[PDB]
């Protein structure tokens, strides 16, 4: 009785199908387009968050004469936020994810330090890095 | 003498002039977006294996990624002999009202359609803003046009790539029932009188519902 | 989302400057408390803005009708892969779709 | 005239408009998450060997891992001509109330669904907090939406990627 | 604003000196007073349609 | 070639945008004696912009996409810094980069 054999058609088609899936399952060249779409989504998220913050949160107004938080409460003890219409003073961009403002300041100081030559501003930025 | 007759004659001439290119571009979009087995005319005859082993889509993805990594924008520069501070105000206005997501999305849509089909487009519109106006309680934004091959019909007597010599252009709007109602509310039209126009799409894929209402905007 | 022109009040801040407060946000709660606190009204304008309303619904009835929520935008953020329109028909694709045909063959032959 | 009737009409129009894309996305999720032998219509006929020799899952894992190594977040910048410190308070609030695990998990879920199916989503909600409020005894958090292809239905007359 | 049978808005004047539509083209030209534009997908349609058929 | 065609499209976009801005926006005229915005309102309280014919003072080119003028200024300062040797103008440009 002849030994079992895999037909030439089966082997050829398995190889061809695997090669086809290998060639087609290549996003981009890299996920730059997907990352840019995520960046667009995060920009929309920032827009929505800014709107909600203006609606419910207590946004101080910075005077140049200091943050002057102007609010008042009703007779039912509920406090109603008073937000002026000069609220859209900042726009939205995409950057690295930081857990706190101190981490962002540290990253910014380190980025500046990496480009400044070893002069006096280098000493200033090093002392500022030790600051935070 | 009739204004409608003249507008329709111009639109019909332009529509018939660019029939072949529009058909080829629509076929390209369907081939590269929906299915490469564009066999709508006779497919309900018998069931046989039809596999899609794509080999062109990675190239399109690579080209779109390549063109995405290098954004391009306008840059206003002072003319010869003009003050060196001639273009800072205009540039500030442009960067102010073109930083939103709509402008980037419209440019990306146009670029993708240009790579795949060969033609894309976008539009510039002006609206009234009371919260964050760019100037004079008004803003200018950029809006996208999907399938610009069949939805934007240019003057046939235009021999420029940017169509700056074109003297008229018709944009076909297809919209849902709620979309039509809001369009009529916005433009003070009659919502009860449902409009109609030349349908640019083709019912080729087995889509359950392609319910659309067509209107046209004629610029001259 | 409903975009409409609503009343806004231009007061005078007792500290400095003049502010703008939407009439709906202080309609009854503190509308008289600004006068007590030292805010006096100098003008009233009509400003266009968007408001977001949420309704809880089932297939047969409406439980909550038009509950106003914070923000000018719908609070849902979508993320897309390869996105576009073919014939007024939105199409979005990831990385798995185009590999479904070949892989399904590779599973069959190996089976 | 009926509010329920109008809401249902809008929902039905939107649901019927995006039937094919939703079906394809659900098929993609099932193929890449449960089993590649999507033979539910006829499987209880006879028992034959059906093996799953996965060839696409390593690619999905690689793409998800590579997209996870570059986190992306909002960054508020002062407008042109505004005070240079115009975005410090808003950025501080955003970092305060988006540092929790829910926001990261929602973004990761949306990214994974975007890579696999092609669409994902998340939501922004506001709640009342008494122990650690961000401001005005309230907090804003981000919540996930699983299978956003079939659970979130948008207005059909929208031609923008972010559906603004 | 026009339909196939009537004109809703007649000559609404808009801002600008130019039509507000900006087109983008790939490979663009004229053959015989006939505009032709092409992308990257057209010339690959014939071979790919063969590769789909043979593998089928 | 596709990027060049896109650049042509963006130049046309800039032309159209400049025309619209001259039509509806408030374009100040800069005097050398300061921006003097000259406008007036009608009896119907509607303000009508007054734009002189000296409006096409700038032409259109193609450059990198920037979200705001501050980002563009930062990019220009960085570009100048990368070509200037470490002399006095290098210190000047470094202080200017810390400026913005």
From Swiss-Prot, chain C:
Superkingdom per UniProt: Viruses
Protein's UniProt name: Portal protein
Family label: Belongs to the p22likevirus portal protein family.
Organism, scientific name: Salmonella phage P22 (Bacteriophage P22)
Span of the entire protein shown here: 225 to 335 of 725
Cellular compartment(s): Virion
Assembly behavior: Homododecamer. Interacts with the terminase large subunit; this interaction allows the packaging of viral DNA. Interacts (via C-terminus) with the head-to-tail adapter protein gp4; this interaction participates in the head completion. Interacts with the scaffolding protein; this interaction initiates procapsid assembly, thereby ensuring incorporation of only one portal ring per capsid. Interacts with the capsid protein.
UniProt function note: Forms the portal vertex of the capsid. This portal plays critical roles in head assembly, genome packaging, neck/tail attachment, and genome ejection. Procapsid assembly may initiate with a nucleation complex composed of portal and scaffolding proteins. The portal protein multimerizes as a single ring-shaped homododecamer arranged around a central channel. Switches upon genome packaging from an asymmetrical conformation in the procapsid (PC-portal) to a symmetrical ring in the mature capsid (MV-portal). This change of conformation may serve as a signal for headful packaging.
